Amino acid sequence: RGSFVEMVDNLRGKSGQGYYVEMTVGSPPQTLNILVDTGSSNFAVGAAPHPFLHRYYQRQLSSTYRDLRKGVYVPYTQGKWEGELGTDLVSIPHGPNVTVRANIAAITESDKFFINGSNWEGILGLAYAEIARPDDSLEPFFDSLVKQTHVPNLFSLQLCGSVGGSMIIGGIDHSLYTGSLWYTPIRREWYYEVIIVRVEINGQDLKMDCKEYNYDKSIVDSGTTNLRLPKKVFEAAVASIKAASSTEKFPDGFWLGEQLVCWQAGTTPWNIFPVISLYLMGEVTNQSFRITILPQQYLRPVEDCYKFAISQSSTGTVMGAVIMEGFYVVFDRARKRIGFAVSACHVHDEFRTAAVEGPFVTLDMEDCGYN
Ligand SMILES: COc1ccc([C@]2(C)CCSC(N)=N2)cc1
Ligand code: NA
Ligand code: NA
């Protein structure tokens, strides 16, 4: 409890391409880099010599492999994969000293899923069984871990925006945040669903029915890069951010993420950009808190040039890496809640820092939840 030095700095990544942890599967162990994803629930790994992959899971080499004689087909908005299901022994070298039998989807065919140039070979869905493929009876990795060990039912993520960070399995490390942790209830155990109750751009409420903030859901997701907002909320938010920094101008498509923009090294005009504040439902009736992020978070370096790291959605609000890189995030599954605290590693300046502040009084927070 409280200190987990061995798991500190166990995540690596490429900006925009996610964060991965090193894992081992099978006996003797085969080492793989695995994408950490709080927005899905399958543990799936490449199992065939696709040209983009550095390595892949060779089942024939594992004496502890067991076939489930079951296929699974998984499409996305863009990507897709299919695989064969099985179980085998799994470890996290820079994690708790335990081994568990878990479900593994051996990816045998894929399309627009593996990234050419990326250093990961699979994906660890850390979300709940409800959203597992093909159905909720396929036990997700973290469930199996908790059932078979004395590892407490929680994990936390410190993503430092080339990129690095920490996944602390089964605990919290207090050296990874400053100030206090504030908690938001997980509304339902499927995705890590939460309720946003208010959005401010540089102090200014957007005066939207808060039900719009959560249409049709809001989630904390480490596998998505951007802050994603519902169309209606997105429109208002760009309108408000456009207005706050119309001191200078950029092409109209930049806000849609259809192009980039540049400045000279040493001094970028950070300060003409507004903070964004999300107010989250708190632990207590009529009590909320807020997290505030800097431009440093929603202006993502590309290569001194930056892309606009907020974009629209038809799936609800998605607090991707943009949000999460400002914060130490605790997925406290045991008490059905997500904790936020200001990250010890987050990218700030001499002027403003990311913030987690409360309590605030918000009435009718239940009305913001979409049914
Ligand atoms: C970078 O490759 C990825 C990342 C994430 C995902 C999924 C499984 C679906 C898209 S969004 C998400 N969090 N998880 C699928 C592929
Ligand atoms: Na247990
Ligand atoms: Na601390």
PDB file of all heavy atoms in Angstrom, residues 32 54 69 130 141 147 161 261 343 356:
ATOM      1  N   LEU A  32       5.977  -9.520 -24.677  1.00  0.00           N
ATOM      2  CA  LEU A  32       5.253  -8.694 -25.637  1.00  0.00           C
ATOM      3  C   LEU A  32       4.967  -7.299 -25.085  1.00  0.00           C
ATOM      4  O   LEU A  32       4.804  -7.121 -23.881  1.00  0.00           O
ATOM      5  CB  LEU A  32       3.941  -9.386 -26.049  1.00  0.00           C
ATOM      6  CG  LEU A  32       4.066 -10.834 -26.564  1.00  0.00           C
ATOM      7  CD1 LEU A  32       2.759 -11.604 -26.385  1.00  0.00           C
ATOM      8  CD2 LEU A  32       4.544 -10.919 -28.014  1.00  0.00           C
ATOM      9  N   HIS A  54       6.857  -6.368 -34.477  1.00  0.00           N
ATOM     10  CA  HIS A  54       8.172  -6.805 -33.974  1.00  0.00           C
ATOM     11  C   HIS A  54       8.205  -8.229 -33.477  1.00  0.00           C
ATOM     12  O   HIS A  54       9.210  -8.924 -33.629  1.00  0.00           O
ATOM     13  CB  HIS A  54       8.654  -5.893 -32.834  1.00  0.00           C
ATOM     14  CG  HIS A  54       9.093  -4.548 -33.303  1.00  0.00           C
ATOM     15  ND1 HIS A  54       8.216  -3.499 -33.462  1.00  0.00           N
ATOM     16  CD2 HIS A  54      10.306  -4.090 -33.690  1.00  0.00           C
ATOM     17  CE1 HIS A  54       8.878  -2.439 -33.894  1.00  0.00           C
ATOM     18  NE2 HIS A  54      10.148  -2.774 -34.051  1.00  0.00           N
ATOM     19  N   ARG A  69     -11.429 -23.440 -28.395  1.00  0.00           N
ATOM     20  CA  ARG A  69     -12.176 -23.854 -29.595  1.00  0.00           C
ATOM     21  C   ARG A  69     -13.316 -22.892 -29.876  1.00  0.00           C
ATOM     22  O   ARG A  69     -14.483 -23.277 -29.938  1.00  0.00           O
ATOM     23  CB  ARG A  69     -12.658 -25.314 -29.491  1.00  0.00           C
ATOM     24  CG  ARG A  69     -11.520 -26.314 -29.619  1.00  0.00           C
ATOM     25  CD  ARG A  69     -11.811 -27.671 -28.992  1.00  0.00           C
ATOM     26  NE  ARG A  69     -10.536 -28.304 -28.650  1.00  0.00           N
ATOM     27  CZ  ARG A  69      -9.952 -28.234 -27.453  1.00  0.00           C
ATOM     28  NH1 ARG A  69     -10.544 -27.581 -26.451  1.00  0.00           N
ATOM     29  NH2 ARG A  69      -8.775 -28.824 -27.251  1.00  0.00           N
ATOM     30  N   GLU A 130     -18.983  -6.673 -19.236  1.00  0.00           N
ATOM     31  CA  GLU A 130     -20.133  -6.271 -20.029  1.00  0.00           C
ATOM     32  C   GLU A 130     -19.805  -5.950 -21.503  1.00  0.00           C
ATOM     33  O   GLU A 130     -20.616  -6.229 -22.408  1.00  0.00           O
ATOM     34  CB  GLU A 130     -20.826  -5.094 -19.367  1.00  0.00           C
ATOM     35  CG  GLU A 130     -22.010  -4.569 -20.134  1.00  0.00           C
ATOM     36  CD  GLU A 130     -23.327  -5.228 -19.743  1.00  0.00           C
ATOM     37  OE1 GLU A 130     -23.348  -6.454 -19.418  1.00  0.00           O
ATOM     38  OE2 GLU A 130     -24.351  -4.492 -19.774  1.00  0.00           O
ATOM     39  N   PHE A 141      -9.071  -9.640 -18.243  1.00  0.00           N
ATOM     40  CA  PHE A 141      -7.823  -9.896 -17.582  1.00  0.00           C
ATOM     41  C   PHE A 141      -7.828  -9.498 -16.100  1.00  0.00           C
ATOM     42  O   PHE A 141      -7.377 -10.271 -15.226  1.00  0.00           O
ATOM     43  CB  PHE A 141      -6.662  -9.208 -18.310  1.00  0.00           C
ATOM     44  CG  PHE A 141      -5.369  -9.314 -17.568  1.00  0.00           C
ATOM     45  CD1 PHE A 141      -4.625 -10.485 -17.620  1.00  0.00           C
ATOM     46  CD2 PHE A 141      -4.934  -8.279 -16.745  1.00  0.00           C
ATOM     47  CE1 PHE A 141      -3.428 -10.615 -16.886  1.00  0.00           C
ATOM     48  CE2 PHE A 141      -3.750  -8.390 -16.013  1.00  0.00           C
ATOM     49  CZ  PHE A 141      -2.985  -9.564 -16.095  1.00  0.00           C
ATOM     50  N   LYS A 147      -9.554 -12.443  -8.950  1.00  0.00           N
ATOM     51  CA  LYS A 147     -10.010 -13.776  -8.555  1.00  0.00           C
ATOM     52  C   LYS A 147      -8.929 -14.750  -8.113  1.00  0.00           C
ATOM     53  O   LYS A 147      -9.200 -15.585  -7.252  1.00  0.00           O
ATOM     54  CB  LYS A 147     -10.797 -14.445  -9.680  1.00  0.00           C
ATOM     55  CG  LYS A 147     -12.257 -14.085  -9.681  1.00  0.00           C
ATOM     56  CD  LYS A 147     -13.089 -15.203 -10.290  1.00  0.00           C
ATOM     57  CE  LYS A 147     -14.592 -14.912 -10.156  1.00  0.00           C
ATOM     58  NZ  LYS A 147     -15.377 -16.180  -9.922  1.00  0.00           N
ATOM     59  N   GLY A 161       2.833  12.831 -20.865  1.00  0.00           N
ATOM     60  CA  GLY A 161       2.906  13.113 -22.312  1.00  0.00           C
ATOM     61  C   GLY A 161       4.294  13.377 -22.902  1.00  0.00           C
ATOM     62  O   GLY A 161       5.309  13.275 -22.208  1.00  0.00           O
ATOM     63  N   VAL A 261      -0.506  23.576 -37.219  1.00  0.00           N
ATOM     64  CA  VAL A 261      -0.115  24.992 -37.069  1.00  0.00           C
ATOM     65  C   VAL A 261       1.169  25.135 -36.229  1.00  0.00           C
ATOM     66  O   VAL A 261       1.457  24.281 -35.388  1.00  0.00           O
ATOM     67  CB  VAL A 261      -1.274  25.868 -36.490  1.00  0.00           C
ATOM     68  CG1 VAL A 261      -1.543  25.549 -35.011  1.00  0.00           C
ATOM     69  CG2 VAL A 261      -1.000  27.360 -36.704  1.00  0.00           C
ATOM     70  N   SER A 343      -1.207  15.368 -11.373  1.00  0.00           N
ATOM     71  CA  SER A 343      -0.030  14.553 -11.646  1.00  0.00           C
ATOM     72  C   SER A 343       1.277  15.247 -11.210  1.00  0.00           C
ATOM     73  O   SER A 343       1.462  16.432 -11.464  1.00  0.00           O
ATOM     74  CB  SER A 343       0.018  14.266 -13.152  1.00  0.00           C
ATOM     75  OG  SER A 343       1.165  13.510 -13.476  1.00  0.00           O
ATOM     76  N   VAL A 356      -7.141  20.010  -9.580  1.00  0.00           N
ATOM     77  CA  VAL A 356      -8.291  19.250  -9.118  1.00  0.00           C
ATOM     78  C   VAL A 356      -8.789  19.917  -7.841  1.00  0.00           C
ATOM     79  O   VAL A 356      -8.121  19.870  -6.812  1.00  0.00           O
ATOM     80  CB  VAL A 356      -7.949  17.761  -8.848  1.00  0.00           C
ATOM     81  CG1 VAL A 356      -9.216  16.973  -8.577  1.00  0.00           C
ATOM     82  CG2 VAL A 356      -7.202  17.154 -10.028  1.00  0.00           C
TER      83      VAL A 356
END
